[PDB]
Each structure stands twice: as structure tokens, then as C-alpha cells.
Amino acid sequence: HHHMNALEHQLDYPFADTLPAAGDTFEVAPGVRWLRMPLPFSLDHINLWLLRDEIDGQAGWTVVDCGIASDAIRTHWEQIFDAHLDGLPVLRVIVTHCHPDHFGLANWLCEGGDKRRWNVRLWMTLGEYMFGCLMAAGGAAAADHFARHGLTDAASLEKLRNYYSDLVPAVPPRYRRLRDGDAVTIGTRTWRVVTGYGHSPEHCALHSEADGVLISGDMVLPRISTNVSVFDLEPEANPLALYLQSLGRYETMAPDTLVLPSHGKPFRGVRTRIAQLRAHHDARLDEVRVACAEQPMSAADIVPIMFRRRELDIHQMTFALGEAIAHLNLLWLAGELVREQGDDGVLRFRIA
Amino acid sequence: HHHHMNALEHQLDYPFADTLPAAGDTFEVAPGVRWLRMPLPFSLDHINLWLLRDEIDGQAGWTVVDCGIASDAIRTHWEQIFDAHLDGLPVLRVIVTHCHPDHFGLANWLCEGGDKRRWNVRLWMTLGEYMFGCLMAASNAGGAAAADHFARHGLTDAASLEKLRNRRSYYSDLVPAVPPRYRRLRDGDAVTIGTRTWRVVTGYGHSPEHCALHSEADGVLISGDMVLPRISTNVSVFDLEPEANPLALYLQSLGRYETMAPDTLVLPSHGKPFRGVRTRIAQLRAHHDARLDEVRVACAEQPMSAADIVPIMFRRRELDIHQMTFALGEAIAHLNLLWLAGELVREQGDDGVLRFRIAR
Ligand SMILES: [Ca+2]
Ligand SMILES: [Cl-]
Ligand SMILES: [Zn+2]
Ligand SMILES: [Zn+2]
Ligand SMILES: [Zn+2]
Ligand SMILES: [Zn+2]
Numbered sequence: 001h002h003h004m005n006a007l008e009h010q011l012d013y014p015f016a017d018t019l020p021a022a023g024d025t026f027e028v029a030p031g032v033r034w035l036r037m038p039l040p041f042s043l044d045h046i047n048l049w050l051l052r053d054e055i056d057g058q059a060g061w062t063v064v065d066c067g068i069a070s071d072a073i074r075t076h077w078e079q080i081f082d083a084h085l086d087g088l089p090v091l092r093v094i095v096t097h098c099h100p101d102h103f104g105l106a107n108w109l110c111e112g113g114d115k116r117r118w119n120v121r122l123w124m125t126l127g128e129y130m131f132g133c134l135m136a137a138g139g140a141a142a143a144d145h146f147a148r149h150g151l152t153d154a155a156s157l158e159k160l161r162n163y164y165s166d167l168v169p170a171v172p173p174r175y176r177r178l179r180d181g182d183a184v185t186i187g188t189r190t191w192r193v194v195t196g197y198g199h200s201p202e203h204c205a206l207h208s209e210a211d212g213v214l215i216s217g218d219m220v221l222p223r224i225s226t227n228v229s230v231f232d233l234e235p236e237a238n239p240l241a242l243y244l245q246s247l248g249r250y251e252t253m254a255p256d257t258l259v260l261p262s263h264g265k266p267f268r269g270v271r272t273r274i275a276q277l278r279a280h281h282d283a284r285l286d287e288v289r290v291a292c293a294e295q296p297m298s299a300a301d302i303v304p305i306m307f308r309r310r311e312l313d314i315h316q317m318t319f320a321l322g323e324a325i326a327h328l329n330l331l332w333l334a335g336e337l338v339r340e341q342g343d344d345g346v347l348r349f350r351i352a
Numbered sequence: 353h354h355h356h357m358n359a360l361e362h363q364l365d366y367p368f369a370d371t372l373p374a375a376g377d378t379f380e381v382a383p384g385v386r387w388l389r390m391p392l393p394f395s396l397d398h399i400n401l402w403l404l405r406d407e408i409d410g411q412a413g414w415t416v417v418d419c420g421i422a423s424d425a426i427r428t429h430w431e432q433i434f435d436a437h438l439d440g441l442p443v444l445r446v447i448v449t450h451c452h453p454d455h456f457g458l459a460n461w462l463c464e465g466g467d468k469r470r471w472n473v474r475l476w477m478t479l480g481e482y483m484f485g486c487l488m489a490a491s492n493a494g495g496a497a498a499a500d501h502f503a504r505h506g507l508t509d510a511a512s513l514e515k516l517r518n519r520r521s522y523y524s525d526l527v528p529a530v531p532p533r534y535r536r537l538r539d540g541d542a543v544t545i546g547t548r549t550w551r552v553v554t555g556y557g558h559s560p561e562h563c564a565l566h567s568e569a570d571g572v573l574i575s576g577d578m579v580l581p582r583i584s585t586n587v588s589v590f591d592l593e594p595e596a597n598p599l600a601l602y603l604q605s606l607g608r609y610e611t612m613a614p615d616t617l618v619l620p621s622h623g624k625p626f627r628g629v630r631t632r633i634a635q636l637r638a639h640h641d642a643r644l645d646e647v648r649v650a651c652a653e654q655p656m657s658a659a660d661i662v663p664i665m666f667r668r669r670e671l672d673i674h675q676m677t678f679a680l681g682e683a684i685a686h687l688n689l690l691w692l693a694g695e696l697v698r699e700q701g702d703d704g705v706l707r708f709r710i711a712r
Contacts, residue, residue, distance in 0.1 A: 121595075126480050126484075126560050126561070127479050127480055127483065130480065130483035130484055130487060130560070131479075131483055133487055134483055134486055134487055134490075137487075137490065141532060173497070173591075173592075174591070174592060174593065174594055175592070175593060176593065176595050177593055177596060179556075197538075201479055201483070202479075232533065233532075233533060233534070234533065234534060234535070234536055235533055236474075236535050237536060
């Protein structure tokens with residue numbers, strides 16, 4: 001499903017192949033601890049952050065992201081509670097975006113974990129909190145969306161008509177809203193909210209400019225590309241253009257910025273990684289331009305060029321198809337393509 | 353009621369004096385821009401909606417700005433607009449400035465073509481307004497969460513708290529349906545409508561991500577609820593975001609209009625088209641500074657809950673449960689602004705009520 005970074009050697013990993021063991025922490029900067037939780041997908045882990053802090057005279061910790069709601073991840077959090085918090089409480093929970101591996105356990109943490117050790121506030125952007133609430137409170141519409149984009153396998157379309165709430169079983173009933181540019185004081189640092197678009201409604205990245213640390217969430221990952229998909233809720237969305245524009249926010253940061261990604265390892269070379277991501281989507285866009293210059297193309301037609309050797313499952317094709325529509329929509333909305341609905345009800349794109 | 357009337361209204365210019373379109377009729381306020389006025393059954397008895405002459409993909413028609421609540425009266429007048437005042441051309445799309453029921457309630461009914469299913473068109477909206485409306489349509493001024501929120505801000509009247517719990521369906525009755533898809537508007541986006549390029553100008557504090565539309569070349573501003581000539585814009589703190597700072601957000605958002613050309617024709621959602629956008633911003637700022645000062649003074653005397661500020665902020669007024677809801681939320685907005693800035697200290701008393709006193 002993901003696109004792997006073959007130019008990883010152009011990045012430098014300041015801790016080489018060190019990984020915190022499940023249930024342990026590793027200090028990546030003074031008062032900034034790295035946690036790694038297991039996930040049962042092809043992406044087998046998420047990195048979470050523990051930040052030493054003091055709010056209103058109470059010493060403690062600010063958590064960044066939560067994990068999915070699994071028994072494994074709950075157990076590792078309790079180990080961390082017992083052993084690696086210096087006996088201090090969590091003071092608040094910051095969540096970068098609504099996706100289940102970042103948000104699933106936000107309510108459990110806010111309610112103090114299995115032993116209800118504290119009661120603290122969720123911090124989140126409005127778009128991520130609203131969308132997660134909506135998704136945690138939720139079909140045929142998705143099947144028709146993909147049908148117009150070339151998914152004609154009758155078995156596949158029927159399966160789609162017939163997951164989030166299991167991983168995000170509960171949502172905090174209140175939140176404190178973060179917005180772009182907000183200053184969040186955490187321990188000795190001023191972290192600045194840096195909003196990102198295209199991947200999710202209103203992704204919150206945190207930048208500590210004085211010492212050059214970036215909690216990049218899923219917007220800048222060293223080993224994989226960031227998913228951008230067009231879904232049925234917003235069928236004319238331009239997430240790829242939104243994503244490429246949001247990347248400009250990191251291109252200007254200091255070259256030695258320590259990037260703390262949600263997947264992969266802490267790395268330096270944020271400007272180098274942005275250049276790789278731009279090249280990748282420009283190469284992927286060019287493949288679409290070429291294909292649409294021969295004959296009109298649907299998203300299902302685009303998938304085998306964009307994603308060579310998928311052998312993909314039904315769930316996998318959902319994100320592959322959504323990414324093709326993202327690339328087709330960028331060129332369509334930019335005037336490089338013309339979109340037409342064929343007699344079979346499928347949407348196709350051709351060069352202008 | 354709960355709105356603050358503009359005593360300096362004479363400093364604004366109304367290019368159409370006291371002209372008002374009749375219900376079911378339109379009045380042209382600028383080339384290709386028609387004004388509709390719908391009735392509402394509140395103390396605010398109307399909302400202005402906008403019809404913009406347009407052409408998308410070669411099909412001539414109309415882009416609608418805002419919808420009305422879903423009342424029988426408002427549906428009837430819309431059907432009259434379709435039959436008589438559209439030149440027999442279809443609606444092409446519906447733009448909604450924010451999620452509030454009088455702007456959003458009939459968006460789905462409009463998009464699906466009204467009672468006669470005359471067309472099928474796309475909703476245009478900011479992500480924050482669309483998500484929040486969907487959530488509330490599935491609220492701010494009703495439900496057990498709202499009653500507990502206002503109870504800790506000083507509302508003790510047993511009947512009012514009972515009335516608040518039963519308004520669990522206050523929002524869903526006015527917005528009975530919501531469109532299942534949307535086209536996202538963002539700050540700075542250019543929307544080509546007819547002969548104009550309108551720019552999205554986002555505003556905060558009143559609602560999640562309020563969309564105003566600015567046509568810079570000819571000086572037209574569809575201000576939604578952010579700039580109203582006769583009343584202030586409501587800023588409320590609700591249960592979902594209890595430490596919110598909507599007044600700071602609102603006062604900051606007003607800068608986007610403060611710099612606009614002085615000759616700007618403002619098309620507000622309540623009141624009449626006017627000129628004097630800069631003057632009205634100056635009025636609103638002076639107004640919010642005077643209310644903030646009243647709160648500072650009161651909180652220097654004794655600890656004050658929001659319920660204690662309401663009789664000060666809204667002098668000698670008889671408020672029903674709907675009115676008291678927004679009055680209470682605005683008092684919390686003013687208290688929160690001062691608290692978060694460090695001028696006040698917030699403490700919860702043994703009765704569970706939050707009270708504010710000046711920082712010493
Ligand atoms: Ca938003
Ligand atoms: Cl757009
Ligand atoms: Zn993600
Ligand atoms: Zn992720
Ligand atoms: Zn409103
Ligand atoms: Zn309104």
C-alpha cells in the first residue's frame with residue numbers, strides 16, 4: 001500500500017538503529033522521550049512522545065498521540081505509568097490527527113488509564129476532533145464513489161457495500177482547540193502549532209524553533225510517503241495539492257532540525273526529505289499525464305501504473321484507488337485534464 | 353432578548369434606505385446579486401439570503417448563499433422564488449457561510465431541488481462548519497451536556513435546567529437533514545461566480561470556520577454573521593470546548609474587514625446592506641472593550657460566575673431559555689478572555705460553580 005523511500009541513505013539517523021523497547025522510553029532530547037508502540041498492520045508501529053512538563057505547579061508529562069485501543073498498547077502504557085514516569089502524572093494529551101493509531105486511546109489516557117490515575121484534557125485541532133467524533137459515531141455511498149472511478153469487479157463492489165469505532169472505541173467529550181501558530185508551552189520549550197492539510201482535515205505538527213525539534217506526525221516520514229486520498233465525503237477534494245503546499249512549512253526550517261516522525265526513526269534532513277517527496281509526486285503525476293495523453297483513463301486504470309505489483313486486498317484497493325483519484329483531481333482541477341463521465345457511468349480523464 | 357443594539361447606527365450608510373424585499377421576492381443590490389429576506393420565528397425575525405447569477409459548465413443558473421431554517425414558511429417562499437424569480441433557470445450550487453440553523457437548515461432540501469426535486473447540486477462549505485453541523489444534526493443550546501455546562505457557570509433555576517434537557521432536539525428539528533457530500537472552501541480560495549472572483553475570508557469566534565465572501569474588484573462583501581449593522585455577533589463558550597476563547601478569536605478576525613476599502617458594500621445576514629465597514633468594526637471593538645471593562649470591575653468586587661455577569665452585561669432584561677443560553681455563553685466568553693489573558697483567576701466552589709476574580 002505504501003511507497004518506500006529508496007534514498008533513505010540521504011537522511012541521517014542520529015540514534016542509528018536504536019529503538020525503545022515496548023513498554024520503555026528513550027530520551028531523544030532533554031525532557032523529550034520516545035515511545036514505540038506495536039500495531040497489527042503492515043505498518044507495525046507508531047511512535048508516541050512523552051514531554052516533561054509542569055502546569056500550574058504540578059510536575060508531570062504531556063503525551064503526544066496515543067495508539068489504537070489494543071490490549072497490547074494498553075499494557076505497555078501501564079508499564080510506562082508504573083516505571084518510566086518518575087512517579088509523576090500525565091498533565092494533558094495532545095493528538096496530532098484523528099487517525100486511529102494517533103487517537104484511539106485518547107479517551108482512555110484522559111480518564112487515567114486502567115487505574116484512573118488522573119483526569120486531564122485532550123488538545124486537538126477542531127477539524128481533527130470533529131472528523132474523529134463523526135467517524136467514531138458512524139457504506140453504499142463509498143461503493144458508488146469507487147464505481148464511478150473504474151472499480152467494476154462485481155464481487156468487490158458488493159463487498160464494499162456490506163472498523164474505526166473498534167480502534168477508537170471512545171472519544172473525549174471535551175477538547176481544548178489548537179490552531180496554526182498557537183504557542184504551547186511544554187517544560188522549557190515553546191512549541192508552535194504548524195497545521196498541515198491534504199492528509200487529514202487539520203493536522204497538528206509541533207515545532208520547537210529555538211532548539212530545532214519537529215514533531216511531524218504523519219506529514220514528514222523518513223521511510224514512507226504520506227497517504228493522500230479522495231473519499232466519497234469530498235469527491236472533488238484536492239488533497240495532493242493541499243499536501244504539497246503544506247510541505248512548504250517544513251522546507252524553511254533549519255537544516256539540522258531533529259524530526260520526530262510518527263513512523264520510522266528520528267532523523268535529520270527535513271529539507272532533503274521534502275525534496276524526495278516532491279520528486280516522488282512529480283514523478284507519479286507525470287505518469288498520469290503520460291497515461292491520459294494516450295487514451296482517457298479512470299482511477300482503476302491509473303492504479304496499475306502508479307502501484308506496480310500490488311496483489312492487493314479489497315481494503316488495500318480502497319487507499320490505492322483514493323490516491324489515484326487524488327492525482328487525477330490535482331491535474332483535473334489545474335486544467336491539465338478534462339473529466340468526462342462515460343456511457344457506463346465511469347469518470348475518465350484526458351489531456352486538454 | 354440577547355442582542356446588543358447599535359446606538360451609533362446613524363454613522364452607517366444604507367444605500368437602499370429602508371427598502372426590504374418582500375418574503376418570496378428578490379431585490380437587486382448589485383449586478384447579478386439579488387437579496388432575499390426570509391422570516392424567522394425568534395427575536396431575530398429574519399435572515400437575508402443571496403442569489404448570485406452564475407454560469408458553470410455553460411449552464412446558466414444561480415448560486416445560492418445560505419438557506420434558512422427548515423420551516424414550512426421558509427419552504428413555501430423558496431418554492432415561490434423557484435417559480436417566479438429565477439428566470440426559469442436552475443440553482444447550480446449552494447454555499448453556506450456557517451453551520452447555524454438559520455444558514456444551514458434547508459441546505460439539503462435546496463441541494464436536492466426543493467419539494468419538486470428540480471435539480472441535484474453540490475454543497476459548498478468550510479470543513480469546520482460542515483463537520484460541526486453534521487455532528488450537531490446527529491447541540492450548543494440543548495442536551496444534558498449543555499445543562500451541566502451552564503449549571504457549573506451559575507444556572508441554578510430548576511425549570512431552566514429541565515427546559516435545557518428537553519431541548520435535546522432543538523438543533524435537529526431546524527436542520528432535519530444534511531447533505532452527504534460537500535465541496536470544501538478554505539481561507540483565500542477564489543470562487544468564480546458570474547462576472548466576479550469572490551475570495552473566501554474566514555472568521556473565527558462566532559462559529560468553527562465562518563466563510564465570508566469578498567469580491568475585491570467591485571467592493572462587495574457577503575459578511576455572514578461576522579459584521580452586522582444593528583446587532584453584535586454572538587460569541588459563546590459551549591460544553592464541547594469549555595476553555596475556548598471565542599471573543600479573542602472574534603476580535604482578531606475583525607482585522608480582516610478593518611483594512612477593506614471604505615466604500616465596501618456589506619451584505620450582512622441580518623439588517624440591511626450598508627456602507628461603512630471600517631466604522632462598524634470600530635464600533636464593535638469599542639463595544640466589546642466596554643463589556644470587558646464591566647466584567648473586570650465586577651470581578652474585582654467578589655468572585656463572579658457567568659450567571660452573575662448576565663444581569664450586568666444584559667441590563668434589566670427578561671430572557672427566555674433560548675435567550676438565556678446565548679446570554680450565558682457570551683458572559684462565559686468574556687470571562688474566559690480575561691482569565692486566559694491572566695487578568696482573572698478561576699476557582700470552582702463547593703457548589704460546583706466556576707467563579708472568577710481579578711488576579712492580585
Ligand atoms: Ca477546521
Ligand atoms: Cl474550491
Ligand atoms: Zn495518518
Ligand atoms: Zn499514522
Ligand atoms: Zn450565526
Ligand atoms: Zn445568523
